[PDB]
Amino acid sequence: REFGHLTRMRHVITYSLSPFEQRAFPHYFTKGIPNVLRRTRACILRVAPPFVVFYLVYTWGTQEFEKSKRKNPA
């Protein structure tokens, strides 16, 4: 597993450019923000629902504990 015989691959041309001739933060905010928003939108509906459930049960459990120790009247 070393460079030289990893695999076989043909008819691909890749162009690059020296790091000393191109910007290191190209449109970091012009295109960074829309990309971040799209990434967030892609995974929000599958990431949030478990954690919001966790928060709901956190509040429910804590408040039920505190209520259960209320002197009860009886």
């Binding site: 460079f3 030289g4 043909r10 041309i13 162009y15 690059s16 450019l17 020296s18 000393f20 001739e21």
Partner: protein, 440 residues
């Protein structure tokens, strides 16, 4: 005759200038043959995106019939007197030279006057030539050396006319019409951009009379190119089916001017050249070549000095298998920085001798002499005498080589072009890191 006296004994190149701007020049000798040809300043560097390939097309059409000489009749002349008619179009020069006998100069110049002025551009001939150029392009696609060099030019001068190839894209080849060809020849084949060189047994006054009798009715008394920009990049045409992997790495070098060319060539002479079918093998003074022969890293390698009017490419090109690209990149960069940081005196002396031999032996035979005349009156503006070359080589020492290599090699962004099984080829960051030494 202690060498220097021999250099002085070389006859000089007399230079004249017609009223039309034709720089007629000639070098007289005693041989019974001659090589006379016009060098024009046309080429792909002066070709726009749509016109790209028109120079190659017009060079193709030049020999296939003129106005006064219809078709093969022109060729009928060239073979009848034993003349060899030849042409070549570089990215910045074009030339049509006719080897002939010293007694055939009056006719040969006439033929040249017909080739560059009264061309034919026959439409049916254009159609016949279009598929020929297409098949020639297909043939050159298999030329893994020319393809790599064109890749280097495209990836080094991207966004500039110098990136364009000589033949041009096939799209332009099929699109090009007669109007574009005649416009190109009328715009670029101007008298001030032409030099009528003639080496061999031709007397300069006879050449001047012939040029004034034939090349008189040329243009009176404009593409002047734009300074191209070097862009350190890389192209990787990964194709593992190819047997070997051609790699070419270059840096922005000097131009035809900028005398730094003379020391720089010496540095290249230090690196030298090698291939499998060489002689001494693991004994040649070049450490690169000695290591290559010792470990059989490659099948070939060379150091080029492609220099254009305002810029140029300086670097190496090696052909090796898929399993040894990294090692030769390492060794080539190591040799470059060894020259850059500590070039020693003995290697400089060897480079001076090698460069002396190159210039002296290259300029033998009427064809190389005439080509040198035509190319020098275009690039340098003057036929540089061999004595001046000797003096310029003599001025080169170890410190000069170290300084010039530091100026052009050390900490510079290179342009890389690899074709074939180039998976091993180190990423551009590793190459650029190899372009500087931490120890120094």
């Amino acid at each position: 005759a202690t060498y220097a006296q021999a250099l002085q004994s070389v006859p000089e190149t007399q230079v004249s200038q017609l009223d039309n701007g034709l720089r007629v020049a000639s070098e007289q000798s005693s041989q019974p043959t001659c090589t006379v040809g016009v060098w024009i300043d046309a080429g792909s560097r002066y070709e726009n995106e749509k016109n790209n390939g028109a120079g190659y097309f017009v060079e193709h059409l030049a020999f296939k019939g003129t106005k006064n000489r219809p078709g093969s009749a022109l060729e009928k002349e060239v073979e009848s007197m034993g003349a060899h008619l030849n042409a070549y179009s570089t990215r910045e020069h074009t030339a049509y030279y006719i080897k002939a006998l010293s007694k055939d100069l009056p006719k040969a110049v006439e033929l040249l006057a017909d080739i560059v002025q009264n061309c034919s551009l026959e439409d049916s001939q254009i159609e016949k030539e279009r598929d020929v150029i297409l098949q020639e392009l297909q043939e050159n696609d298999s030329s893994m050396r020319d393809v790599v060099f064109d890749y280097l030019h495209a990836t080094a001068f991207q966004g500039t006319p110098l990136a364009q190839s000589v033949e041009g894209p096939s799209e332009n080849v099929r699109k090009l019409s007669r109007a574009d060809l005649t416009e190109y020849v009328s715009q670029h084949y101007k008298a001030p951009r032409m030099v009528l060189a003639a080496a061999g047994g031709v007397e300069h006054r006879q050449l001047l009379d012939l040029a004034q009798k034939h090349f008189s009715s040329l243009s009176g008394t404009v593409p002047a190119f734009t300074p191209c920009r070097f862009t350190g990049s890389e192209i990787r045409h990964r194709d593992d089916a190819l047997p070997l992997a051609h790699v070419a790495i270059a840096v922005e070098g000097p131009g035809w001017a900028n005398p730094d060319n003379v020391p720089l060539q010496v540095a290249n002479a230090i690196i030298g050249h090698y291939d499998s079918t060489y002689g001494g093998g693991t004994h040649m003074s070049s450490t690169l070549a000695s290591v290559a022969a010792t470990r059989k890293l490659c099948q070939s390698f060379q150091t080029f000095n492609i220099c254009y009017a305002e810029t140029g490419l300086l670097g190496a090109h090696f052909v090796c298998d898929n399993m040894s690209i990294d090692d030769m990149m390492f060794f080539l960069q190591g040799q470059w920085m060894r020259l850059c940081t500590s070039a020693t005196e003995s290697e400089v002396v060897r480079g001076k001798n090698i460069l002396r031999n190159a210039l002296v032996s290259h300029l033998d035979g009427t064809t190389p002499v005439c080509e040198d005349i035509g190319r020098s009156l275009l690039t340098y503006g003057r036929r540089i005498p061999l004595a001046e070359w000797e003096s310029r080589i003599a001025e080169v020492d170890a410190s000069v080589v170290r300084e010039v290599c530091s100026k052009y090699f050390y900490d510079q962004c290179p342009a890389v072009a690899g074709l074939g099984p180039i998976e091993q080829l180190p990423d551009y960051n590793r190459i650029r890191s190899g372009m500087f030494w931490l120890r120094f």
